[PDB]
């Protein structure tokens, strides 16, 4: 275009906040004005009072984990019909990653809301409502494991 006026439009605002001058953020420094304004506090987020913070709540969310580590087990990832509608043919995993959802998340489990469509769908698990809607015209590649 040209060298002059290519400049950032509207809101660029770099103008940070300097606190040094009679007008703006003098003395104290745009906050502070007491003491314990020097190198920091302790958080607060969780910390301070000298109290109990809020560590009184109990963790019934048991099953923290044993020392050997988490147990390697197959994790399932959902995907409603609404998505699938998009394309025809035979849908399969890998084919679903090289597109939208899933991506290595391991084990596809189609299900939920949306209308079914006449097309084979290779999965690993199927909700009740899925098997239903799909019976009304459409695939069913199940089993797998090979």
């Amino acid at each position: 275009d040209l060298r002059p006026n290519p400049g950032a439009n509207k809101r660029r605002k770099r103008v940070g906040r300097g606190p040094g001058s009679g007008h703006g953020k003098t003395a104290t420094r745009g906050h502070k004005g007491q003491k314990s304004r020097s190198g920091g506090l302790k958080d607060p987020r969780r910390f301070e009072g000298g109290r109990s913070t809020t560590l009184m709540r109990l963790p019934k969310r048991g099953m923290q984990g044993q020392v050997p580590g988490e147990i390697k087990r197959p994790r399932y990832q959902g995907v409603n019909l609404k998505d699938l509608a998009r394309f025809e043919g035979e849908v399969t995993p890998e084919l679903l990653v090289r597109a939208g959802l899933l991506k290595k998340g391991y084990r596809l489990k189609i299900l939920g809301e949306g209308e079914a469509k006449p097309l084979k769908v290779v999965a690993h698990a199927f909700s009740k409502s899925a098997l239903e809607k799909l019976k009304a015209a459409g695939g069913e590649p199940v089993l797998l494991e090979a």
């Binding site: 009184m56 709540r57 109990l58 963790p59 019934k60 969310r61 923290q64």
Partner: peptide
């Protein structure tokens, strides 16, 4: 994490004490 869970609306939830 060992005692609280955050919902989908962004609400913190925990067990009654």
């Amino acid at each position: 994490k060992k005692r609280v869970k955050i919902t989908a609306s962004g609400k913190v939830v925990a067990m009654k004490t």
